[PDB]
Amino acid sequence: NKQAAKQLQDLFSSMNRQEPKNAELFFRVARPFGRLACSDPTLLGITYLMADRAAQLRPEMAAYVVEAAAQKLMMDETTNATERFTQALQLDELNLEANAGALEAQIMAGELEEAAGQIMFLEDMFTNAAAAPTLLYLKGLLAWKQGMPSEGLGLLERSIAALFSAAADFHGPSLELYAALNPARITAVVRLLLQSIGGEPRAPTEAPSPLISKVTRALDLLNKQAPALQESALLHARALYLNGNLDGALRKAGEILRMNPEESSAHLLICSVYVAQDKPELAVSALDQAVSSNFAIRETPLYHVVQAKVLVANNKLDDAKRVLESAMNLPGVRTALTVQQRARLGRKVVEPTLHERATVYLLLADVLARQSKIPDAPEAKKYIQDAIREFEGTSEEVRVTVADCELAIARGDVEGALKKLRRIPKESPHYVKARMAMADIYLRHRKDKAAYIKCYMDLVDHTPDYDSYCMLGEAFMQIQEPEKAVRAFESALEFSPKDVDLITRCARALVTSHDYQRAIDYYTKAIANARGGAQHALQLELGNLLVRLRQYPAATAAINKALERNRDGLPATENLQLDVEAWSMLAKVHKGKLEMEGYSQAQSRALELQKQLLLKLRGELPEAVALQRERTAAICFDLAEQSKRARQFDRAMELYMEALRHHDTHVPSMLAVAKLHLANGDTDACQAQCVTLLKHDPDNEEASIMLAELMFHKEHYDTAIYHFQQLLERSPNHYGALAQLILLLRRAGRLEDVPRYFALAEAGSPKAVMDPGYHYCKGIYNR
Amino acid sequence: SGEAGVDSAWRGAEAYHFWLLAHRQLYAGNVDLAMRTALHLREYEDLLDPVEIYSFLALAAFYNQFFGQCSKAFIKLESMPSIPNDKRESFADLAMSIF
> Residue A416 and residue A402: Cα distance in Å, rounded?
11
- Given a contact cutoff of 8 angstroms between Cβ atoms, the answer to whether A514 and B74 are in contact is yes
Q: CA geometry: angle at A160 spanning A159 and A161, to 5°?
A: 90
Task: Report CB contact under 8 Å: B71, A516.
Answer: no
Residue type at position A592? G
Nearest residue of chain B to residue A513 (CA atoms): B75
Among A289, A365, A279, CA closest to A321: A365
Q: How many Cβ atoms from other residues are within 10 Å of residue A354's Cβ?
A: 22
Distances (CA, A) of A173 to A68, A134, A229, A568: 20, 21, 8, 11
Helix axes A230-241, A264-276, angle to 10 degrees: 20
> Residue A531 and residue A213: Cα distance in Å, rounded?
11
Distances (CA, A) of A86 to A55, A90, A340, A449, A740: 12, 6, 18, 63, 91
Nearest residue of chain B to residue A516 (CA atoms): B96
Helix (H, G, I), strand (E, B) or coil at A277: coil
Task: Report CB contact under 8 Å: B75, A485.
Answer: no
Helix (H, G, I), strand (E, B) or coil at A507: helix
Of B27, B75, B80, nearest to A478 by CB-CB distance is: B80
> Residue A599 and residue A556: Cα distance in Å, rounded?
12
Q: How many CB pairs under 8 A join A and B?
A: 31
> Residue A206 and residue A770: Cα distance in Å, rounded?
49
Distances (CA, A) of A324 to A287, A555, A580: 15, 57, 53
Among A369, A440, A434, A372, CA closest to A400: A434
Nearest residue of chain A to residue B24 (CA atoms): A770
> Residue A466 and residue A457: Cα distance in Å, rounded?
13
Give the side-chain half-sphere CA count within 13 A for A345.
Answer: 13
Of B71, B79, B96, nearest to A477 by CB-CB distance is: B79
Helix (H, G, I), strand (E, B) or coil at A229: coil
Helix axes A63-73, A78-91, angle to 10 degrees: 160
Residue type at position A218? A
Task: Report CB contact under 8 Å: B80, A511.
Answer: no
What are the residues of chain A with a beta carbon less than 8 Å away from any beta carbon of chain B?
477-478, 480, 482, 485, 511-514, 516, 548, 770
Nearest residue of chain A to residue B82 (CA atoms): A478
> Residue A334 and residue A327: Cα distance in Å, rounded?
7
A436 torsion bin: left (phi>0), alpha (psi -120 to 50), beta (else): alpha
Distances (CA, A) of A627 to A521, A619, A693, A763: 34, 10, 18, 40
Nearest residue of chain B to residue A474 (CA atoms): B80
Among A45, A54, A67, A47, CA closest to A26: A54
Q: How many Cβ atoms from other residues are within 10 Å of residue A138's Cβ?
A: 26
Q: Which 8-state DSSP code applies to residue A338? A: P
> Residue A741 and residue A755: Cα distance in Å, rounded?
11
SS3 per residue for chain B: CCCCCCCCCCHHHHHHHHHHHHHHHCCCCCHHHHHHHHHCCCCCCCCCCHHHHHHHHHHHHCCCCCHHHHHHHHHHCCCCCCCCHHHHHHHHHHHHHHC
> Residue A84, exposed/middle/buried by CB under 10 A (0-12, 13-18, 19+)?
buried
Residues of B in contact with A478 (CB under 8 A): 80
- The residues near A234 (Cβ < 8 Å, ≥ 6 apart) are A39, A253, A256, A263, A265, A266, A269
Q: What's the distance, CA A245 to chain centroid?
A: 4
- Given a contact cutoff of 8 angstroms between Cβ atoms, the answer to whether A367 and A312 are in contact is yes
- Given a contact cutoff of 8 angstroms between Cβ atoms, the answer to whether A349 and A341 are in contact is yes
- Given a contact cutoff of 8 angstroms between Cβ atoms, the answer to whether B94 and B80 are in contact is no
Residues of A in contact with B78 (CB under 8 A): 482, 511-512, 514
> Residue A321 and residue A294: Cα distance in Å, rounded?
20
Distances (CA, A) of A494 to A117, A502, A521, A528: 38, 10, 14, 18
A481 torsion bin: left (phi>0), alpha (psi -120 to 50), beta (else): beta
- Given a contact cutoff of 8 angstroms between Cβ atoms, the answer to whether A47 and A77 are in contact is no
Q: Which 8-state DSSP code applies to residue A442? A: I
Task: Report CB contact under 8 Å: B75, A516.
Answer: no
- The residues near A653 (Cβ < 8 Å, ≥ 6 apart) are A673, A676, A677, A680
Of A482, A516, A548, nearest to B79 by CB-CB distance is: A482
- Given a contact cutoff of 8 angstroms between Cβ atoms, the answer to whether A291 and A268 are in contact is no
Nearest residue of chain B to residue A485 (CA atoms): B79
Residues of B in contact with A511 (CB under 8 A): 78, 92, 96
Q: CA geometry: angle at A330 spanning A329 and A332, to 5°?
A: 115
Task: Report CB contact under 8 Å: B96, A482.
Answer: no
- The residues near A399 (Cβ < 8 Å, ≥ 6 apart) are A358, A361, A362, A387, A388, A391, A429, A430
Residue type at position A549? L
Task: Report CB contact under 8 Å: A478, B75.
Answer: no
Task: Report CB contact under 8 Å: A511, B92.
Answer: yes
> Residue A198 and residue A130: Cα distance in Å, rounded?
37
Give residues preceding each break in chain A, C–N over 2.5 A.
132
Helix (H, G, I), strand (E, B) or coil at A44: helix
Taking the CA atoms of chain B, what radius of gyration do you get in angstroms? 14
- Given a contact cutoff of 8 angstroms between Cβ atoms, the answer to whether A516 and A510 are in contact is yes
> Residue A411, exposed/middle/buried by CB under 10 A (0-12, 13-18, 19+)?
middle
- Given a contact cutoff of 8 angstroms between Cβ atoms, the answer to whether A662 and A678 are in contact is no
- The residues near B88 (Cβ < 8 Å, ≥ 6 apart) are B77, B78, B81
Task: Report CB contact under 8 Å: A514, B80.
Answer: no
> Residue A152 and residue A145: Cα distance in Å, rounded?
8
> Residue A658 and residue A636: Cα distance in Å, rounded?
7
Among A131, A128, A73, CA closest to A105: A73
> What technique solved it?
cryo-EM
Tell me the structure's resolution in angstroms, rounded to a single decimal: 20.7
Residues of A in contact with B76 (CB under 8 A): 480
Task: Report CB contact under 8 Å: B92, A513.
Answer: no
Residues composing chain A = 783
Q: Which 8-state DSSP code applies to residue A539? A: I
Of B76, B79, B96, nearest to A516 by CB-CB distance is: B96
- The residues near A582 (Cβ < 8 Å, ≥ 6 apart) are A540, A543, A559, A560, A562, A563
Mutation target vs B (from A474, A486, A512; most B CBs, 10 A cutoff): A512
Residues of A in contact with B96 (CB under 8 A): 511, 514, 516, 548
- The residues near A408 (Cβ < 8 Å, ≥ 6 apart) are A414, A416, A417, A420
Residues of B in contact with A488 (CB under 8 A): none
- Given a contact cutoff of 8 angstroms between Cβ atoms, the answer to whether A61 and A54 are in contact is no
Residues of A in contact with B95 (CB under 8 A): 512, 514
What is the rounded end-to-end Cα distance, in angstroms, of chain B? 42
Q: Which 8-state DSSP code applies to residue A352? A: P
> Residue A58 and residue A51: Cα distance in Å, rounded?
10
- Given a contact cutoff of 8 angstroms between Cβ atoms, the answer to whether B38 and B57 are in contact is yes
Handedness of CA A472, A276, A320, A336 (dihedral sign): negative
Task: Report CB contact under 8 Å: B80, A477.
Answer: yes
Q: What's the distance, CA A537 to chain centroid?
A: 18
Nearest residue of chain A to residue B77 (CA atoms): A512
> Residue A262 and residue A587: Cα distance in Å, rounded?
46
What are the residues of chain B with a beta carbon less than 8 Å away from any beta carbon of chain A?
27, 71, 74-76, 78-80, 92, 95-96, 99
Q: If residue A138 lies in a helix (H) or strand (E), which one and from where to where?
A: helix A134-146
Distance of residue A584 Cα from the nearest chain B Cα, in angstroms: 21
Residue type at position A375? P
Helix (H, G, I), strand (E, B) or coil at A468: helix
Residues composing chain B = 99
Distance of residue B10 Cα from the nearest chain A Cα, in angstroms: 24
Helix (H, G, I), strand (E, B) or coil at A591: helix
Of B27, B74, B76, nearest to A514 by CB-CB distance is: B74
> Residue A542, exposed/middle/buried by CB under 10 A (0-12, 13-18, 19+)?
buried
Distance of residue B14 Cα from the nearest chain A Cα, in angstroms: 22
- The residues near A186 (Cβ < 8 Å, ≥ 6 apart) are A159, A160, A163, A164, A218, A222
Task: Report CB contact under 8 Å: B92, A512.
Answer: yes
> Residue A160 and residue A154: Cα distance in Å, rounded?
10
Of B76, B80, B95, nearest to A514 by CB-CB distance is: B95
> Residue A761 and residue A731: Cα distance in Å, rounded?
8
Q: How many Cβ atoms from other residues are within 10 Å of residue A469's Cβ?
A: 24
Return the exposure string of A420-458: e unless at least 16 CB atoms fall within 10 Å of the residue's CB, then b: bbeebeebbbbbbbbbbbbbbbbbeebebbebbbebbbe
Distance of residue B98 Cα from the nearest chain A Cα, in angstroms: 9
